[PDB]
Each structure stands twice: as C-alpha cells, then as structure tokens.
Structure 1
Amino acid sequence: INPVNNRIQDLTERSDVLRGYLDYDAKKERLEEVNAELEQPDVWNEPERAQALGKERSSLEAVVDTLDQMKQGLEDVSGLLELAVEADDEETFNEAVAELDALEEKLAQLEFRRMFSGEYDSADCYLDIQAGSGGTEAQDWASMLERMYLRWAESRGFKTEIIKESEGEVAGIKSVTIKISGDYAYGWLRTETGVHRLVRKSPFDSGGRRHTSFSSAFVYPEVDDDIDIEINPADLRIDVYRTSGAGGQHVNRTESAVRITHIPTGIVTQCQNDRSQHKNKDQAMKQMKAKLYELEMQKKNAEKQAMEDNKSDIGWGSQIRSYVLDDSRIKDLRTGVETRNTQAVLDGSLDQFIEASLKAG
C-alpha cells in the first residue's frame, strides 16, 4: 500500500518532470497556435508549410494527449487504490497493481525515448581510456576507471571485450579500448565522455603528498560497415588515345592509352604502361576505384581528426567528474550530482550520474 503510494508519487514527479522538461505550457500553447493556423484556410496555400504544421501537430498532439491521458489515469488509479484499500478487495487491489504497472511501462517508454533521442543511441559502443597529467598516478587511475566501467557494464548486463590495451610500465594502463555490446549501450555510455579528475594521496610519491591525476574516457558508437558501391558506368568518361613517346608504326597508330574521368567528382586516372588498351583500361579502372575509396577515406580521416582536435586535453581544467577521496566526495561538474560513497561509485554505481546526465539531456 505505502510502496504503491510511493510509486504513485514517483510517477507524479516523473510526469511533472516530463511536463516541465518539455515545458508543457509552452508545448500546449504551440499546439494551440498550430491548431489556429491549420484552421485558417491560408495554411494550405503552401503545401510544405501545411505538411510541416501537420507533422508538428501530430507530434505535439502525441505528447499533449499522452500527458492529458496520463494525468487522468494517475488520478483514477489513486482513487481506485483508495477504494480498494478501504474495502479490502484483494482482486481490485491486484487489478489496480496491474493498471499501475501498465501505466508505469507507458511512462517508462516515454522516458526511454527522451533519454535516448539520439540517432546512434541504440548501437553498441567503444570506450577508450587514456591516462593524462598524473603520469604513473594517471595510469593507475586509468586502470581504476577501466575496472569501474567494466563493473558497471556487468551490472547493466552488457558484454565487454578488450580490443586493445597498453599497460603502464610502473603501474596501471596507459590506454585501453573496450567494446561494449548491449541494448542502447551507446545511449547509456555516451554521457561518460570527458576527463575524470582524481585527488588522492599518490601512492607513487615517497612523501605521500596529495596529488591530482587526470584520465580521459571517450565513447563512440560502432559504425555500420559501408556497403560497397560499384562505379555506375554512366558516371565515367573513357578516352582512348595514342601514348606518349610512341615508337614504331604500330604504336604511333594505335590508341592504347586510356584516361578515365569520374563525372560526379572530376577525379581523373590514366594508364598507358601496357601495349593492350584492355589492360590499360583495367588498370585505370582499378586506380579510379582506389582513388574514390581514398577520397572517402580522406573524408573519414578528416572527421576523425576534427574529433581529435575537439577532444579536450587530459589535464587541469578539463574535468567533468571530480573524485576526491580524502574529502570522500565525488561530484559531477555538469549536473551537480554529488555523492559520498566513493567506494560504491568506484565499484560501479554510475547509474546516478548517468541517469542525471540523460535526464538533463
């Protein structure tokens, strides 16, 4: 009974949090404005505008109608629970429990969508941990972070494997790459990207001074393998001509050199090494395929390099989560969530921080 009331209060707070995160007043006003515009005849004068307003109305209607139905269901379940407890009706109590479970699953589906609105949130992920400013202390801290994330993955039921690892010579690990597989693994882990600051009496200092070490965790989704696309022959222009420095009547006369131009790109390859035009054309086609693939590879490398330049350095001022063990306090800089059970957090109780980050969005 009291746990059911606590569940109802939690659902009420979750519904209010959803309404306020979504600014239910703002969304309802926007929906009303869209309704007025759509009642106006001039709205369909621009078909793209009318379709956009229709899709916007459908989404706003989904949200608004879902919330309007949800609130009423919660009030009804509260009333039926009061009646069932008063009348000591076990069947009605069980029916109300089933209704509350169904409504909780519904609100949970909404919460899940809001938690993972990102495109690749469903995919598996890769986690890279790199030591930073602390040196040997940083490498030990990196090993601690690796253990923490592995424990958290075990708790969530995801499957982990170690693709690559580089261990520090004195202690810890310099870097590690781990593959995480599971449902919405990237969605659950993507908020842990950043630099983690650690403050503890360094075990690698003879004086036992209080040093600060930094380690970086970077989470990226598992990209799907690209489908190979054969070159559409209508995209190529092939020119056959005499090769340079042609020696002899035959070579002077024959059109052996081949040049292939890719119309969409403008990239050109050319081969004239062989006597045979067919062999030259095959080699030029291979070079054209290689050049198109290299162009795509250069695009991919540019994206990766932009990400590397975007990655903040593993050092002072780049912390997003501070683990101070002397003060026995862990604080997330982004969300403000603070805990004192450093041992539990190091053992894998990351759900508080991760859920806070996802709710903040």
Structure 2
Amino acid sequence: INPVNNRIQDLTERSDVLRGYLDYDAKKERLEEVNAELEQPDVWNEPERAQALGKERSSLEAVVDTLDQMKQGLEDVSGLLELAVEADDEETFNEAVAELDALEEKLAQLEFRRMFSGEYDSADCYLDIQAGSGGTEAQDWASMLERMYLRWAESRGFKTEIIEESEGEVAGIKSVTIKISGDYAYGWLRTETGVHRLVRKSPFDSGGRRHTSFSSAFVYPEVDDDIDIEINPADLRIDVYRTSGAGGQHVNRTESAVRITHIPTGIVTQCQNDRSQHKNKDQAMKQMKAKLYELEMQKKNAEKQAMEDNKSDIGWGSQIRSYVLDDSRIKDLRTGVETRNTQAVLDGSLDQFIEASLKAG
C-alpha cells in the first residue's frame, strides 16, 4: 500500500488530461510536417523561412519531446516504484519519490505552457470595477464584489494598492482601481474581466422584491513602464481636481484625483495615490497606455486571433458570472462550474473558477 502510487495513479490520469489538452495526436502530426519542409533544398535559399521553420521546430520540440519524455519517463517511474515495493530497497523507495516529483515538475513546465502566458501575464496588473444602475443596490454589489477581491489576493499573498476609489453615495463605489503586485498577477486575474450578475432579495425595499444588480470588472496589466510604442499626443487632456472629503481616514489621505482621458476610442483613467500632481499623472498615463494596450489586443481577437469566425461573432464574454445569493448558486457562464458556497467565494475561494477560466483562456 503506497499513497505515492495513489498519486502516480492521479498524475497519470492527469497526464491523460495533459495529453487531452494539447491534442497529442496532432502535436506529433504537425512536428513531422516541420520535418518534411526542412528537407526542401531551398532551406538555405529561403533564409527567413529557415529561421522560422527552425522556430516552428524548436517551439514544438520543447513540447512534443517533453510529451514523449513524460511518456517514457512515467513508464519507468511506474516501474521504479512497483519494483521498490516488491523488493524493499530503501534507496529505491527514496529515489522513486524524486522520480515522481520531477515528472510533476515537467507537468508544472506544461502548466505555464498550457496557460500560454505571453505578453504581460507574468506581470502585475490593475483592477477596474464599475457599479451598475439603480442606486444603492448597485454600489453595494460594487462594494461586496470589490472587497471580495481585496480579501482574495491577501490570502494568495498578492500585494494590494488602491490606485483610485470613487465612492458612490451610500455604502459603495461607482468606480475603483486597484494595483495587484505579484508574480503572474495578471495571469491569475486576466480572465475575470466582464460583467458580474448579482441576484438577491434587496434589503432596501419593504417586503421582498428579489432585485437583479449588475457590475463589471476590468483587468488590465502593467505594460513594463512603456509598450515601446508611444501613442501619447492623441488629444491629451488633464483635469486634476479635488476629491470627496478626506474625512478622518478616507483613502490614501490624498483626495487629489488626476482625471486623464484618451478622446479617440474614449479611454478614461484616473489616479489617487498622492498629493504630488506630477507623480499621479505619471502613474495614470502608465495605466492609460495599458488600458489602451488591452484595446490593441482585443482588435486582434476581433479579426482572427481567438474568435473562430464560423457563423457570426463567436464570443461576447460580458455575462461571465451569476451570483444568486438567495439560492446559494454561483454559476460561471463560460465553463459551467458551479458552487453551493456563497460566503466561501465571497471570502475568495475563486480557484475553482480560475481553472475554469484557465481552460478557455
């Protein structure tokens, strides 16, 4: 009896899923297609193609060979454990532990590769949550959702910084922006962008009347201080002005917002870190470009990046979550992962939806 073998059983079935993700058949089919095209006598005569054919080769060789490394590797680890239990070699028991873990460390190498983290997915990011309509019901949902995310990253260890927070009227905000410092911080949060539906009996009306509130959240990364493509001039606009009341221990003890707009395509960012006007406008233009950066990536998806124009515009990830409090049923509209624990996911038990969003993102 060995629970390590019970993990070898678990890792192998997961490996079948890891093979089930990448379409392991077509991986070996395409890799031989790069092989046949390099036999072509004009490899040296097509230089740019040659560096590209090697690029198509080397990118798959780090995956297909690893997939075959996990194939023949696991079969030997399947041998080294069962030989150890049936012969009682204490070192063979000790070595098989390192033999199983390294395969998971290859599964961990596939983990970031399956996540296909590119541009700024390994970097920190910013949040942007807007309140819906209907007075106090919307701002509470703005608040309760935001303060769930604030209690979320603290459990994961991501440093949180409220860049800007604009309180609506009665217990809640209308817009908020939070900087999330962390490794792969954009990677764990990118897929949460969209509109989040709240369904509950409102506490604001006598009787009952289950009310449906809406609120959206927008996650845009940190663009490495410069994208390397500055589209600055672009009808720039500064509007720096005093904010609500600095009452007692109000946010950052600043009340000095820097409202900056990007008139073409209508992008609006703002910052409320410090009293130094020149400091905030420096930080706000950083996120203005980042918000402009996510606009540039959506255009690729708008053509032929990941939409698959088959019949029509296959997408519209606006309604991505539904939070029904009085039925205790949280449903994700992108995968269908459901959970019957409201206060747990109101505390930050969102890993079940991250893996759900990791699949289609």
The interval holding the TM-score normalised by the smaller chain is 0.7 to 0.9
How far does residue 203 in structure 1 lie from its aligned partner after superposition?
Answer: 1.0
Contact 1:240 1:255 (C-alpha < 8 Å) held by counterparts: no
Contact 1:165 1:175 (C-alpha < 8 Å) held by counterparts: yes
Structure 1 residues 23-57: Cα deviation after superposition (integer angstroms, max 9, x where no partner): 22112111112212212324443222222212111
Distance 2:343 2:114 in 1: 30
How far does residue 339 in structure 1 lie from its aligned partner after superposition?
Answer: 1.3
Per mean C-alpha deviation after superposition, the further-off stretch among 73-82 and 254-263 is: 254-263
Structure 1 residues 272-322: Cα deviation after superposition (integer angstroms, max 9, x where no partner): 999999999999999999999999999999999999999999999942111
Q: Check 1:299–1:358 CA distance in 2 against 1; reply closer, same or farther (3 A cut).
A: closer
How far does residue 356 in structure 1 lie from its aligned partner after superposition?
Answer: 1.9
1:7 aligns with 2:20: no
Per mean C-alpha deviation after superposition, the further-off stretch among 265-274 and 48-57 is: 265-274
1:249 partner SS: coil
Contact 2:234 2:262 (C-alpha < 8 Å) held by counterparts: no
Q: Check 1:113–1:246 CA distance in 2 against 1; reply closer, same or farther (3 A cut).
A: closer
Per mean C-alpha deviation after superposition, the further-off stretch among 133-142 and 203-212 is: 133-142
Q: Check 1:6–1:327 CA distance in 2 against 1; reply closer, same or farther (3 A cut).
A: farther
Contact 1:131 1:139 (C-alpha < 8 Å) held by counterparts: yes
Q: Check 1:288–1:211 CA distance in 2 against 1; reply closer, same or farther (3 A cut).
A: closer
Distance 2:46 2:252 in 1: 64
Q: Check 1:359–1:90 CA distance in 2 against 1; reply closer, same or farther (3 A cut).
A: farther
Distance 2:319 2:37 in 1: 48
Contact 1:312 1:318 (C-alpha < 8 Å) held by counterparts: no
How far does residue 152 in structure 1 lie from its aligned partner after superposition?
Answer: 1.6
TM-score norm. by structure 1 comes to 0.72
Q: Check 1:290–1:224 CA distance in 2 against 1; reply closer, same or farther (3 A cut).
A: closer
How far does residue 186 in structure 1 lie from its aligned partner after superposition?
Answer: 0.7
Distance 2:275 2:203 in 1: 72
How far does residue 155 in structure 1 lie from its aligned partner after superposition?
Answer: 1.7
Structure 1 residues 197-221: Cα deviation after superposition (integer angstroms, max 9, x where no partner): 0111111122221111111111111
Per mean C-alpha deviation after superposition, the further-off stretch among 300-309 and 339-348 is: 300-309
Distance 1:165 1:204 in 2: 24
How far does residue 240 in structure 1 lie from its aligned partner after superposition?
Answer: 38
Distance 1:93 1:112 in 2: 30
User: 1:287 corresponds to which residue?
Assistant: 287
How far does residue 87 in structure 1 lie from its aligned partner after superposition?
Answer: 2.8
Distance 1:73 1:325 in 2: 48
Q: Check 1:305–1:178 CA distance in 2 against 1; reply closer, same or farther (3 A cut).
A: farther
Contact 2:161 2:180 (C-alpha < 8 Å) held by counterparts: yes
Per mean C-alpha deviation after superposition, the further-off stretch among 228-237 and 69-78 is: 228-237
How far does residue 21 in structure 1 lie from its aligned partner after superposition?
Answer: 2.4
Query: Which of the pair has more CA radius of gyration?
Result: 1
How far does residue 94 in structure 1 lie from its aligned partner after superposition?
Answer: 2.1
How far does residue 354 in structure 1 lie from its aligned partner after superposition?
Answer: 0.9
Per mean C-alpha deviation after superposition, the further-off stretch among 181-190 and 83-92 is: 83-92
Distance 1:183 1:5 in 2: 32
How far does residue 330 in structure 1 lie from its aligned partner after superposition?
Answer: 0.9
Contact 2:162 2:178 (C-alpha < 8 Å) held by counterparts: yes
Per mean C-alpha deviation after superposition, the further-off stretch among 240-249 and 345-354 is: 240-249
Q: Check 1:12–1:23 CA distance in 2 against 1; reply closer, same or farther (3 A cut).
A: same
Tell me the matched-pair count: 361
**Sequence identity percentage:** 100
User: 2:43 corresponds to which residue?
Assistant: 43
Q: Check 1:323–1:252 CA distance in 2 against 1; reply closer, same or farther (3 A cut).
A: closer
Contact 2:198 2:322 (C-alpha < 8 Å) held by counterparts: yes
Q: Check 1:18–1:213 CA distance in 2 against 1; reply closer, same or farther (3 A cut).
A: same
RMSD: 14.1
Per mean C-alpha deviation after superposition, the further-off stretch among 195-204 and 260-269 is: 260-269
How far does residue 266 in structure 1 lie from its aligned partner after superposition?
Answer: 26
Structure 1 residues 313-334: Cα deviation after superposition (integer angstroms, max 9, x where no partner): 9999942111112221111101
Contact 1:15 1:67 (C-alpha < 8 Å) held by counterparts: no
Per mean C-alpha deviation after superposition, the further-off stretch among 101-110 and 232-241 is: 232-241
TM-score norm. by structure 2 comes to 0.72
1:203 partner SS: coil
Structure 1 segments unaligned to the other structure (5+ residues): none
1:360 aligns with 2:333: no
How far does residue 257 in structure 1 lie from its aligned partner after superposition?
Answer: 40
Distance 1:327 1:254 in 2: 41
Distance 2:249 2:3 in 1: 98
Per mean C-alpha deviation after superposition, the further-off stretch among 263-272 and 251-260 is: 251-260
The structure whose residues are more often helix, as a share, is 1
